[model samples]
Target: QTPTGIYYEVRGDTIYMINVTSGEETPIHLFGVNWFGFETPNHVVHGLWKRNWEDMLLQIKSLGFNAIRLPFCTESVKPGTQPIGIDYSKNPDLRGLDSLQIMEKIIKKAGDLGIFVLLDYHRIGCTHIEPLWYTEDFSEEDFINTWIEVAKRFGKYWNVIGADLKNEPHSVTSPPAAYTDGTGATWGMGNPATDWNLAAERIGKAILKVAPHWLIFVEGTQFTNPKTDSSYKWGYNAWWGGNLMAVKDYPVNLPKNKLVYSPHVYGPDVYNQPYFGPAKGFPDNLPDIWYHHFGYVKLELGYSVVIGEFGGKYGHGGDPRDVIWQNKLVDWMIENKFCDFFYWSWNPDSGDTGGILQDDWTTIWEDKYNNLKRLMD
Candidate 1:
């Protein structure tokens, strides 16, 4: 097993992992990719799990990615869970294995391969992604308890360095009053109903009660003061888990040096943002927009920030404009030294943003990989 205390610490906008034994601080650059679909219907990367799971991890390691965002749904690990429906006919090794067991195997193997895993709580259930961490059945208390259980179970693992508290917490846009117009849809503090900041503090403390060393990666909410934003268009313009403008005022008050602010960004391929349509708008205005929404936590506030999810399809039969956006966005990340990032996905099934692996689920997207490989250096 990898040694303990292998965790990242924020120091004046830079992040470094501490070596427990040597007491050395290594500047950590988490060039990684998101491994999705386990948080969805199939409960693992759709086709690759049964046969190519180990190979996929090996391939990610070979491809220069040193970390992986292993996302999973709550139902898979919640109490009384049964074996996920995997076709044992093809890969008998996964035959009777439950979801959490499978996750254990994946994390253990990742440790063996010298790759780090950030266990992301991607969804509340298998069917839909919730705005908050809890649902009707999965209450907030349940959310906290589940994570406490998770921390107890996996916190000791050296490779399990972090816990992504929640996926995307967005406000309801409908009825205007439901979310924005003085109603209740707000990411601001003191709102016990749906304030991600409050929820994160509660859940984060719970996780720390067990695994105090693991970094608590907190994602931004969807709506950030919709009342002040004239461009929100009643939340139609915002994406889930894609806004972090309020971090400056109501920063997550978790344990000191244990917080890593995360935000998900995308380009024209995923969502039609105002930044597209011209090169001048990009490379120049991109930084401002990023700060307003997400980057301020790091650039201005001196917090540790990681672009938890960002990607676009590249290579043959791809949009030229998307390629440019990808390059520029990556370049921006490099320029700012906000280097810790996990590409949107490693699966081929991502509808809006494609993955590092191509349709065959084995072939690498040479163009995409080459573009992202710049950060690995």
Candidate 2:
């Protein structure tokens, strides 16, 4: 890959770090970890209290991963807001930087280490994950402006490949799936007010106007009805961002090779979905269910599908079923050539699924780390 002359793209189901000058493409597998916290009010990645951010990135790279998905909120990038809770003693270099500045520092260091990064918009305000991309405090225009500014600021780094437009654009309590123009997000319903596909296409094109070389990731909603899928009983369904069933119906419009479908899947630890219980098909039936939700995008639709988020307690302290679920999903991912994925976390603070690193922040969770090693082709 060219040092500063490489641009990333998706071809069929594979992503490549291609040479910009010569167009030589080397297929790249996006095995990664999500080091989270910028989404929270902290405005920086967690665990800076235990160790420096540089050391954490170094350890992540040494553990045989190629990428990091940095989660950030809109407020975290705004000027005049300094990042909080970073232990200056451990990270003296990050003492006076704002959130976006801290992010750039991390990206620059990761770029030097040859690690790729995907910036994920995990929240709107520094609060809970909103059902929609915008909130009462932040308008849709604010969301678009945040992305445009981030793209223009960080797109210069070769490692900063693209933006995952909105994280887990799921359902709210209002606006039933049957209602096309209601408050919740729908897909391909021709209701621009509630259509996630339209928002994704519009947001993606807006980013590309400033950063044309970047790839844009679109996630799926959590629920759908027979109106959209001809499937029944849709009060709630699919793992977070795991329902890509609508992609076959309405795909995101973007420049060629500049689009990727990013969906998140989880285990019984996260939720006891019908597939995880006794009725629908407990463990073994997941491959079929996954295909119905997300796998078809890569295998059938000929688009790049990156597992945006997937992990569990890894037989550490969670239920044994979670370990079983994680193992089988990896098997299914490899089985379907869905080889690229980003594990849920590197910080031990994730409430449902702990992380690749134990609470010590120094010891690696070999159980989780070794299991993910099978993803690279």
RMSD each, Å: 3.1, 2.3
Model 1 TM-score on a 0 to 1 scale: 0.90
lDDT of 1 by residue, 143-246 (tens): 88878888888876777777899987776555345453432335664566667887788889888777877888988877755453444332344456777777
lDDT of candidate model 2 versus the reference:
0.82
| Top lDDT hit | 2
- What residue pairs are clashing in model 2? none
Worst 10 residues of 1 by lDDT: 228-237
Q: Which pairs clash (backbone N, Cα, C closer than 3 Å) in model 1? A: none
Instruction: List candidate 1 stretches off by more than 4 Å.
Output: 1-8, 79-90, 174-185, 227-238, 279-284, 315-319
Residue lDDT tens for model 2, 240-318: 6777888876777776588999989888778867767757667878887788788878888888999999988987888
lDDT of each: 0.74, 0.82
For each candidate, give its TM-score against the true structure: 0.90, 0.94
lDDT of 2 at 335: 86
